[PDB]
Symmetry: C2
Subunit: 122 residues, 2 copies
Amino acid sequence: GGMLRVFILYAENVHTPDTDISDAYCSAVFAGVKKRTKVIKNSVNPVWNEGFEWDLKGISELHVVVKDHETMGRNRFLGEAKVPLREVLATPSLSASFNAPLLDTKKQPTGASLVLQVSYTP
Amino acid sequence: GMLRVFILYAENVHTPDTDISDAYCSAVFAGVKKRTKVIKNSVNPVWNEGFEWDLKGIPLDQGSELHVVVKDHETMGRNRFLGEAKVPLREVLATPSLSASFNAPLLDTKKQPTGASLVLQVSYTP
Ligand SMILES: [Ca+2]
Ligand SMILES: [Ca+2]
Ligand SMILES: [Ca+2]
Ligand SMILES: [Ca+2]
C-alpha cells in the first residue's frame, strides 16, 4: 500500500583504512527495514546501479551506511549519511536526486560522496 | 618456564577517521590471550603493562610466535583493527640472558606496513 523506490547509483573517493582497495557496499535502512547492495570488488569509485523497493505497509530520513567488505570477516565502516525525504515530497514528481557527503564515526565528512535517487508512490 | 612480555607503548597508531585512537593491545601466545587497558585519545598510547604465560608443558610447536594486535576502542560501534605484528619469540629470545627488547612494525589487513610500531620487552625463565 504505497512504496519507496531508492536507486543507489554510485560513490566517489571511497577509501579504506589501509592498502586494501575499497570493496564497497551500501546498507540502507528506511522505517527500520534494512536493504543492502552487492559488493563492488576493488574500486575507490563503486558503481552499484541497484534499485530497491520498501513496501510501505499502508503508512523522515533514509539512513545509508557504506561499508568495506572484509575477505571473510566483519565488514568495516567507511562512511554514512542521512538524507531527508521531505525534499522528495517537495517537487511535483515525488522524486529527488541526492549527492550525499559521507560522514565518519565522529560525524566529520570523510571526503567520499554517495549519489542516490528516491521516489514515492503514495 | 615463564614467558613474560611487557607491553610498553605504540607510536604513530591512527584510526581511519577524525577519531583520535583509543588504543588497546592484545597479545596471544599458544591460544592464550592477554589484553592491555584502553588509552583514550592518543596516537602514541603508552600501556606499560606486563603479562605472563606459564608454558606448563603445553605443546612447544617448533615455531610459535607472539601475535600482537592493536585496536581502537569504539563506544557506538565495533572496535577497529589498527595494526598487527608477528613477533618470532625464538629469534628474539636467542640471547645469553633469555630476555630482549623488540620494535614490532605494525602491519595492515593486507600485510603492508601502517607506519605504526609497538615497543615490547620479552623474557623466558627456564
Ligand atoms: Ca579489496
Ligand atoms: Ca576489504
Ligand atoms: Ca578517541
Ligand atoms: Ca575510538
